[PDB]
Amino acid sequence: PRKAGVFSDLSNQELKAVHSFLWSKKELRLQPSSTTTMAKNTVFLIEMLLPKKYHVLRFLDKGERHPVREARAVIFFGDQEHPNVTEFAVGPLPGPCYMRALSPRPGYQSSWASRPISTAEYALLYHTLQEATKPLHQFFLNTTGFSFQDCHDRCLAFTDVAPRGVASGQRRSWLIIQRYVEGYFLHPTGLELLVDHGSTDAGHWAVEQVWYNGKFYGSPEELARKYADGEVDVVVLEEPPLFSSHKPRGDFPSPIHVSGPRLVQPHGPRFRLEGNAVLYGGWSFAFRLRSSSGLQVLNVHFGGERIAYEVSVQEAVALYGGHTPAGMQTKYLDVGWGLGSVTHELAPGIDCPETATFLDTFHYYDADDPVHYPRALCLFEMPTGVPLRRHFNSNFKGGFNFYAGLKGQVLVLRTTSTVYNYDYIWDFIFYPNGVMEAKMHATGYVHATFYTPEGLRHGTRLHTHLIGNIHTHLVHYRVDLDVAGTKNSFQTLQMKLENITNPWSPRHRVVQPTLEQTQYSWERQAAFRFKRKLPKYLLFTSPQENPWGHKRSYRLQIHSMADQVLPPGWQEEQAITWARYPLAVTKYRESELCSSSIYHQNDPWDPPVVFEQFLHNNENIENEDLVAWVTVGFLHIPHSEDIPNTATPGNSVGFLLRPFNFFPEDPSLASRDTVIVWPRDNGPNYVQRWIPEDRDCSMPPPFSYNGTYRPV
Amino acid sequence: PRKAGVFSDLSNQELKAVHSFLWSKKELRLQPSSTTTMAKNTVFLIEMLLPKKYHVLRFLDKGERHPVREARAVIFFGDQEHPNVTEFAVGPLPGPCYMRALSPRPGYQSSWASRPISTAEYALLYHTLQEATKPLHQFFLNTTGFSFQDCHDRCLAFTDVAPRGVASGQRRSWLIIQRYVEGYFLHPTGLELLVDHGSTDAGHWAVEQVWYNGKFYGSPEELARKYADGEVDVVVLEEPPLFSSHKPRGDFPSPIHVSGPRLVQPHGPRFRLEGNAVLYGGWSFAFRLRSSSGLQVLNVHFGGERIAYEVSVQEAVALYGGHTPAGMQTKYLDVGWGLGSVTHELAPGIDCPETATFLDTFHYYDADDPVHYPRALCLFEMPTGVPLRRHFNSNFKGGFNFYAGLKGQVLVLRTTSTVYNYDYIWDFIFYPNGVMEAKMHATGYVHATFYTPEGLRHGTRLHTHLIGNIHTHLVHYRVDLDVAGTKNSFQTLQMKLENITNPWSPRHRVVQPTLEQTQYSWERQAAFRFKRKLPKYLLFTSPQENPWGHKRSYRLQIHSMADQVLPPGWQEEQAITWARYPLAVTKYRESELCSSSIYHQNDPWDPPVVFEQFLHNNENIENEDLVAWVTVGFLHIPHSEDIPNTATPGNSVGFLLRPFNFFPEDPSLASRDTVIVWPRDNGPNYVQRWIPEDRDCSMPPPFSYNGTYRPV
Ligand SMILES: *[C@@H]1O[C@H](CO)[C@@H](O[C@@H]2O[C@H](CO)[C@@H](O)[C@H](O)[C@H]2NC(C)=O)[C@H](O)[C@H]1NC(C)=O
């Protein structure tokens, strides 16, 4: 509440303040993001710029002054001879006085082409594509029944892929032309266009290449002449619902006419929410939605003792192959698209339980004013349907000495990212026994292309005209564990057999397990590449010992199917060198807070952060502020079941943090939810309890869904 | 209901019938299992002996005669010159006429020593240990305050480990001496005794070796003389609750005085249960608790079409190291202990939801009569707290074209096994979109030994006098997939990069994913050892194609941390050669229905099934009845949090079966649970539905727990 305020995202008022401040500086010549020109200076992003960890810890632990509060302000400088992007620490909040230019990068010339694509830019792009396809109007109507001009009922739409070209400083986008219908992602026409939209005058932008149904055509006029002259082999496209729709069809042979079970919370939340500060049994932690990178949890304690200064989403990637130029061009990095800013409204009873506590926020990303995002996050406790622990202590003669068990519950902090086609559900999950989990579930629409037969060596035919392209999902977390404090060491444990004389039968031998430990002293020792077999136990230790002599530690357990995807060193792989390492441990530093950025998507050849560089000074990691970095992911080969959407079952990855000799015993023993039943020969067994059995009823508030996200 | 009866376990009546039948054969000279002698012929196990798959399929698919119903009857022949164990197909049911001797094994002499340990045998063992420790009475009272004689308030108890000796035909058990208190598993005295209980006359059994607090003593009298003469360095042992108890202690700094959310099912079960036959949306399947091996599902269909003839638990293993003779002796294989027969009563609201449908059964395992097991299984639908699918189709200008989502639900078929210290929760889980999952969660008490400092190279100090021994949990499943029918092939898919000229920029290159496939023609090709990297996509295919040209298939996705544990070929590893293979594919055969047995625990050197042998004829697996075999597991290094119990969070393994081009589109589209919200400028959005929004209340039946398991 009062403490966690340091970790809190910017209020509507705070965002408006920083905006007025920057607008008051007339020399910036700022214009709203909506202006219909690239030739413009604009404030593209504003978010809370976290203070130094040193000062934050002195405020939290040493009772010191509250650290100064600061905005990050990403300004696009389109309106000048040499356009660029610059970032700025605007502070203090409240009462802004300065804007301090952030992280200079000498040598680099391509900041302008590395920019994310804005709303305005898309608008202008829609203008280009309308002009340049003028010659193909007839072609469109004959092949698709749709068009870019007038169009009314049947409009052709497009999906830009990224990155945009073949080298740094390029902004040449492959656009996949589709029919704008329900779930338009699944309706490619077969046309693809390369548009150079590099210039700040949209008048110089041009369609530099055409691809149709397996063939390149140079220009639209050329495809038009060649079609008109019978030289283009074309494909003419087509109650019941669209295959691309979520509307039901088919019948289960055992049909279902009622709602399934739901959660009731008659006694209210058992966690205490206050601002961005949560308490839940042993747990205490803060959170934030960083507009740029996504969801975080900060200052995580269990039982008064710190475990993690920060756990946060760093980058989310989708790397594709293809038969078509667009399909082979696609390496999507979502932080270039505002992964934290596409946190669209959760639907009660669907996305989160009806009983969940829904939380709003504001994002200033490619916006004229701060934008209200309703139910951007939810927080809720749910039954797991599996008991946290249980034991049937039998007496092996017909009866029992006792049954004990603690019904399973968990607190879930959830948000989403829906950039375009895909919907990622982000989870941070807190068990009563000190285990924390991180999960990502993928759902929504797959990224897909027009079917030709050559495209089956890069994916799967999902429908008559639809190829689901092969791709890898990879996600990077930053896991700043501060186990029982700032200073830690990292160690790993393996089982190693020993071959020894049988001590009670000297003729024979005993080959058996033995607990082997490995210390790690330098960063590079703890950079585990995908070929390097990952040790079964990954422990981040405190020097303090538990009551039984063992180092107090937290274990990191990764759930993933990731492998190496791009060849190390090759081109666009420079943007995702974190993807070489399922685990990497660095020594903490203010210069290495993020493994990605908003610029990586459009200049992955020469990005402003290469995670590999973090390891270059190969620093000593004995008793230092350590940071774990985790890559989780999976190879997604589309299948017919992904139509209309990828389903979440089994489509999740993440990791667990588990206490390991951190607590003297099971820290969930504090829970009064436990139930022990004791045997009696005569009458009812003694159902021993510490909370009364409850069977109360309550009723959730009625369903509602706004679906809009505007300023306030 | 009428069909699934072929897969159904034996009724109380059926078990009684087979028993009377075998009792009527006077030449067997049978005695009840309770008789206080090993020198006895007894019926140790009776269970339903599944008919041949050929006949079962002709009954299910070809509309043929119902296959004859048969009991398996494991008889111990203790009362003869050469004791042995023999098994028998007793049938037909109803109206038994014969008992046909099962699976002869020429050459083998050690069937008697391979027997599971019975109640009676434990009784006799308690007699031996009381006699033989007579000299140590004083020692016990001085060190432990407890004893084996009179004892009343303070009785010493024991925990036998397995296997029992150093070669086949031995029955020499290391016993860990403990104080019989609440959670006695965690109270080792420091004494260990090797008892040869090989003879059928308990009068010949003898304590052949003693181990105390780091030293072997030959005999009890010798430890007694040496203690009495000041030569034995000993350790004297010790409101608040026992550390080994489930009773709460400690306080959360944010305390919790109310129950957390619970499931209500006001509209009843949405699945139809009839006998051992279940329907749930697309799903149809049967089940059984095989007393010997555990839970199975049989005849699994989705949408009328078969996917799996059988999915079943085959074996569950716990392989330990130790400082002490017992700790280094312990390789527990639970099927030797009646893994399916220790299915003790589920506690409503704890083990399964209050809203679950609880099912009883009967087991005849080491019993004088069939024994009623209340709530041995449960079946229930629960919300996952994650939507099966969802999408926010934005219009990227402040609003939305629609939100769609299907709230997440799942059907869980659950049982447990609690052999002794450990409690395994077995799950079979059915999602509405055709995904099925198999899960095992471990909880209950760890297997532990007396603390000496040498024991820290085989585990962890959990308490003053308690070492939690290092071990590996490994589980074997039999996964008889019959994907769209009996005949299948197995293939795997990988991503393989290609390096090609950039087709739209010939100066540059494109290094990108490409979908590679691998066919498998022989068994040995599909035996993946732990060093052999497992392909990301493991597909069992039908020849039939979907509407888009792709082979209809089900994908197997393993969730595990298993590695090779014992060296292939070395001794007791002969019992667990399935543990070499995270996946193995065999061609179906009536001689290879199980990868383990009830004999493996006590003769793992020369067991009656070696899974490796299944692969020896290396048969062709192109379009044949294939059987998948899966090993899942994890290295368990005990930690202080495992006290008093191992907690289930993150302590689970298993696998998913997912449709892969099996269905023309998402098979969950049949579900009327889906909700689509449509945008409107004026008033409320159109919340489009196919089941009415529901907010009904109901109340679960009040908590109860019997805790006994007797005949009826
Ligand atoms: C990025 O563009 C900004 C805006 O023009 C440049 O910053 C200005 O630089 C000139 C010096 O040539 C100063 O007179 C202004 O005071 C600066 N203003 C601000 C707000 O920064 C900046 O130099 C450009 N970056 C690069 C690398 O050239």
Ligand SMILES: *[C@@H]1O[C@H](CO)[C@@H](O[C@@H]2O[C@H](CO)[C@@H](O)[C@H](O)[C@H]2NC(C)=O)[C@H](O)[C@H]1NC(C)=O
């Ligand atoms: C464990 O160690 C022993 C001793 O090195 C090995 O036993 C020897 O094995 C060879 C055959 O490989 C025999 O010729 C020797 O006679 C054996 N000696 C003894 C004393 O047993 C054994 O192979 C090793 N086992 C493992 C799994 O490493």
Ligand SMILES: *[C@@H]1O[C@H](CO)[C@@H](O[C@@H]2O[C@H](CO)[C@@H](O)[C@H](O)[C@H]2NC(C)=O)[C@H](O)[C@H]1NC(C)=O
């Ligand atoms: C296991 O013990 C059984 C019981 O004695 C043996 O089965 C009997 O064998 C004799 C032949 O020596 C027959 O006369 C009996 O009719 C058999 N009875 C039954 C019920 O099987 C069996 O031979 C023993 N197994 C082995 C391998 O020796």
Ligand SMILES: *[C@@H]1O[C@H](CO)[C@@H](O[C@@H]2O[C@H](CO)[C@@H](O)[C@H](O)[C@H]2NC(C)=O)[C@H](O)[C@H]1NC(C)=O
């Ligand atoms: C992809 O293939 C090309 C051609 O084999 C490789 O490019 C050559 O790389 C070497 C250096 O390793 C240069 O000397 C040649 O001039 C390059 N030729 C061309 C046409 O580019 C490239 O290294 C390969 N990349 C990968 C990741 O395998």
Ligand SMILES: *[C@@H]1O[C@H](CO)[C@@H](O)[C@H](O)[C@H]1NC(C)=O
């Ligand atoms: C959504 O919220 C906006 C902003 O408060 C409000 O004006 C509008 O009426 C709401 N729309 C719906 C459909 O509830």
Ligand SMILES: *[C@@H]1O[C@H](CO)[C@@H](O)[C@H](O)[C@H]1NC(C)=O
């Ligand atoms: C448990 O069930 C048995 C068998 O029906 C019954 O006799 C007994 O009264 C029940 N015990 C309890 C405590 O409910």
Ligand SMILES: [Ca+2]
């Ligand atoms: Ca740290």
Ligand SMILES: [Ca+2]
């Ligand atoms: Ca470094």
Ligand SMILES: [Ca+2]
């Ligand atoms: Ca099969």
Ligand SMILES: [Ca+2]
């Ligand atoms: Ca074979």
Ligand SMILES: [Cu+2]
């Ligand atoms: Cu995907």
Ligand SMILES: [Cu+2]
């Ligand atoms: Cu374990």
